[PDB]
């Protein structure tokens, strides 16, 4: 039996394995938003999200 698809791989950021890593990029719509050190929009130099 072959389980390398679901088993975690150390040679990768975190311990995310292939299947859930592929699933993770499927959402890519909320863009997290869990205050990733917000307040950086002190000067709205970008499109201010």
């Amino acid at each position: 039996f072959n389980f390398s698809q679901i088993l975690p791989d150390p040679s990768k950021p975190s311990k995310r394995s292939f299947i859930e890593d592929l699933l993770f990029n499927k959402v890519t719509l909320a863009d997290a938003g869990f205050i990733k050190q917000y307040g950086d929009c002190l000067g709205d130099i970008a499109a201010r999200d």
Binding site: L42, G43, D44, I45
Partner: protein, 49 residues
Amino acid sequence: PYRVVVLSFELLHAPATVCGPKKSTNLVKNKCVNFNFNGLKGTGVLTES
């Protein structure tokens, strides 16, 4: 001989004619301050963009 001038101005304020803004102040930056740039009012910090 005394020189005299008579001054008369109308009212009802619909044809706004003369008025006067004056009272222009200075500018500061990177500090919390109330702003009244052109009639709009608010509080915040002023920086570049």
